[PDB]
Amino acid sequence: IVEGSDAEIGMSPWQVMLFRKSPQELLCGASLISDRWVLTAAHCLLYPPWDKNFTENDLLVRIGKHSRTRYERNIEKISMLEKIYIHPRYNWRENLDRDIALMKLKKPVAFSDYIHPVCLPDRETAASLLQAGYKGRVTGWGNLKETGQPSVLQVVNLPIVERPVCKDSTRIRITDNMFCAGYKPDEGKRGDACEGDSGGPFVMKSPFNNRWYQMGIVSWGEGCDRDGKYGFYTHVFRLKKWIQKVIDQFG
């Protein structure tokens, strides 16, 4: 996260770290959506242009974390993956369309002060909250700058950007399965996701029921926190039917 701040303890208890077993390193962020299911970006697991194609046994999920590098004894819980499910129409060849994947855990994780699932939006909540200008929150342990690493979880609040502005910022073809967020050059404030934040949640707190909903998944950007550029996020609600189908059939 660029231009963010240290998270408070327990501020993002759905935050998940995807952790590579060998070598031991952060791979991506992700989010806890129930005691056995974790949501992330497809490109975290499968990206042929960079020879990335992880299998279940390559990875661990670390939940309840705050420190990036520490082993947080008695606080974090580390889980093995039973199965990975990548969206069948995930477009890695072009623009990361449908950049979404589910991971089933081998055993249910125990909820605690530091571990708790985020909500997924229903149509009404999405319609109400996904509006240009409305702010969401992005969290992660990724790079603090485009070209080091944070000691603890970083957080930044960012406004959703008008679709025409999103489209006009890039040569990449944007789809209805994506939205963009970030401040404009003239707004003065800044902030963005960066390398290592991929897969993490873009969340909003509903002013209707005061619950946190994951509206987006950190997906792609051209550089990090560049003027006139914006972060792109997978539109979680637009892909909700796939999410439910996977959980229904394999849950």
Partner: peptide, 11 residues
Amino acid sequence: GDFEEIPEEYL
């Protein structure tokens, strides 16, 4: 590789 080792049980 600046990560503290996790318990062997997880690996």
